[PDB]
Amino acid sequence: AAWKWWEEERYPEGIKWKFLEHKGPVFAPPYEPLPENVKFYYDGKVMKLSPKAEEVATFFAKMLDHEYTTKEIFRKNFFKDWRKEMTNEEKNIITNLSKCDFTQMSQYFKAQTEARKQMSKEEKLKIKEENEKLLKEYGFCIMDNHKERIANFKIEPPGLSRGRGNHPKMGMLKRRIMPEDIIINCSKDAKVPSPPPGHKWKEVRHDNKVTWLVSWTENIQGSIKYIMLNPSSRIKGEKDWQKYETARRLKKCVDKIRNQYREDWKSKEMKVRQRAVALYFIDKLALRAGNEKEEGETADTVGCCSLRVEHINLHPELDGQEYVVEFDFLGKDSIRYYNKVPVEKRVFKNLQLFMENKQPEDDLFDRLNTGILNKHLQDLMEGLTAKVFRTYNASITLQQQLKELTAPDENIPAKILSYNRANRAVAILCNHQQAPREENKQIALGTSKLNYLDPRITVAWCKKWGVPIEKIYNKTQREKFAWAIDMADEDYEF
DNA sequence: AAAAAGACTTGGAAAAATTTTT
DNA sequence: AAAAATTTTTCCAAGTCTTTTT
Numbered sequence A: 001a002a003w004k005w006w007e008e009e010r011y012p013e014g015i016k017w018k019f020l021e022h023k024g025p026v027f028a029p030p031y032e033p034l035p036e037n038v039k040f041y042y043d044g045k046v047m048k049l050s051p052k053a054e055e056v057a058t059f060f061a062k063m064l065d066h067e068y069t070t071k072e073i074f075r076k077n078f079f080k081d082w083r084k085e086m087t088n089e090e091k092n093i094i095t096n097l098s099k100c101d102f103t104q105m106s107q108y109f110k111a112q113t114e115a116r117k118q119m120s121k122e123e124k125l126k127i128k129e130e131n132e133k134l135l136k137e138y139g140f141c142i143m144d145n146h147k148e149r150i151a152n153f154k155i156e157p158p159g160l161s162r163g164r165g166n167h168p169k170m171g172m173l174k175r176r177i178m179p180e181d182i183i184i185n186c187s188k189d190a191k192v193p194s195p196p197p198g199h200k201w202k203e204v205r206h207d208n209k210v211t212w213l214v215s216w217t218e219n220i221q222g223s224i225k226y227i228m229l230n231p232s233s234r235i236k237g238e239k240d241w242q243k244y245e246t247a248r249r250l251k252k253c254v255d256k257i258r259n260q261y262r263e264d265w266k267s268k269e270m271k272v273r274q275r276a277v278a279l280y281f282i283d284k285l286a287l288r289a290g291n292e293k294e295e296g297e298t299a300d301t302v303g304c305c306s307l308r309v310e311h312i313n314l315h316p317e318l319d320g321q322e323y324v325v326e327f328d329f330l331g332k333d334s335i336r337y338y339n340k341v342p343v344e345k346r347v348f349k350n351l352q353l354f355m356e357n358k359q360p361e362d363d364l365f366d367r368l369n370t371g372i373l374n375k376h377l378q379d380l381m382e383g384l385t386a387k388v389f390r391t392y393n394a395s396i397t398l399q400q401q402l403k404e405l406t407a408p409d410e411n412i413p414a415k416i417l418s419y420n421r422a423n424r425a426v427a428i429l430c431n432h433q434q435a436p437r438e439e440n441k442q443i444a445l446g447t448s449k450l451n452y453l454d455p456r457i458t459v460a461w462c463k464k465w466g467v468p469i470e471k472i473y474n475k476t477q478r479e480k481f482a483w484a485i486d487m488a489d490e491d492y493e494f
Numbered sequence B: 001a002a003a004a005a006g007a008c009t010t011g012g013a014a015a016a017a018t019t020t021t022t
Numbered sequence C: 001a002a003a004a005a006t007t008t009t010t011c012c013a014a015g016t017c018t019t020t021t022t
């Protein structure tokens, strides 16, 4: 029988668990060497590469078809990192990447892909059965009286970094994660997981103030990557329920907050004027609270608080509309945001004052960062941060649009059209793009449907119109939103 | 403070598995 | 059979906000 964690007494703040036991992470499949017939060339002559160098060479060979393997930054980074993985004998022969011929390696990898879909019933069924025994042995964990699923237990294989957009580190080598890089987290009364034969873990800790099971440091950015519980668990779902509850508490406080920031545009001090114009953008246009990145780590992308002077172009009268602000920046994942939006009279006058005596490279809202904006938002409502406005706007627009687009006389397949049409409006507001059915050509429903929309709004909609939840939510989503699907009436109001 | 770390939050695109069209 | 159009898993990062160092 399935566990209804939502009927339980809410888990206390501070300590995340009392008990934790798991079988550790599943390491990336080992490197299968190149056979004798698959040769590498340098200056037209054959050259057998050492195992370490040959492994790095394969990553490039597999990506050879893409246009990014011809870029300055990619090639510079790849070659620099391939030098480290070479022997002193190889370092003296291989001076540049351009005299290297990977074409034969590339052909073998295409040949293996063509040979992988031609497998028998003893190969196609066997590998899918060894994946199932792996899913049941390492894909589950015990955390406080119950067996819950683990998210991504299979650690990512080594390769070359690409990232999203115009990334400075594209082409850098993602190293193979070893047991000696793993920090295991579990309880003192639990059976500490066994490392692969011949190896030992980096650390075995017992921190109950955190929710992760396994952690390590990746080399590209230096940040800690984690292995946590799947979305269907108590620890993730309760936090997901609390996120929506916070957005619901902002609903009965928004009119009071909107009136306050409208008055703040007139204030004597500029520290308050900028804070209010930035909050106006976050409320109206659902922008992300733009944190400050370190120059040269990730692609140059901004958000609301990190907006520069060059990202906006002021127009008093354009297209027959008053006070137009033309936004043109790259948001998260290098997705372009473009909107010609008519603002209030005081907001336009304020933006003119913020763009004065400044160069294009300078920050628009100086004397303001994400911490100052969130410190103020905490003084208005408890637990309020800038991303709560995005959750609020997305969820309320779905509720509003579902009421507006669903009609009583329509059939079940036609009602699904209306749900997806309401979901479309949420994706346009949140700027969730999908690169090139005529409507949803450039729009992506996935991100909002799972991160942004209180699932109870959908469960309420479904029980009202007689649409079974399986027509809206698939197998995996139904498990993530189980709390909502069980506990929720037709009368749910955000 | 205020930089740096740490711990959460937020798929779409490319491939492979099928299914349908020629 | 053989190819094309769909469906569906496999591949791969980047923000937000909190907590620690410097």
Ligand SMILES: *[C][C@@](*)(*)C(*)(*)(*)(*)(O*)(C(*)(*)(*)(=O*)[O@@](*)(*)*)C1(*)(*)(*)=C(*)(*)(*)([C](*)O*)C(*)(*)(*)(=O*)N2(*)(*)(*)[C@@](*)(*)C3(*)(*)(*)=C(*)(*)(*)([N@](*)(*)=C4(*)(*)(*)[C@](*)(*)=C(*)(*)C(*)(*)(*)(O*)=C(*)(*)(*)([C@@](*)(*)N(*)(*)(*)([C]*)[C]*)C4(*)(*)(*)=[C@]3(*)*)C2(*)(*)(*)=[C@@]1(*)*
Pocket: A152, A156, A332, A333, A447, A451, B010, B011, B012, C012, C013
């Ligand atoms: C595409 C879309 C995005 O980007 C946004 O929007 O933001 C995303 C999402 C949504 O929300 C999600 O969810 N996700 C998850 C994940 C991702 N990415 C990635 C990359 C890489 C890797 O490796 C991974 C895995 N790990 C293990 C965690 C991932 C995941 C995203 C995105």
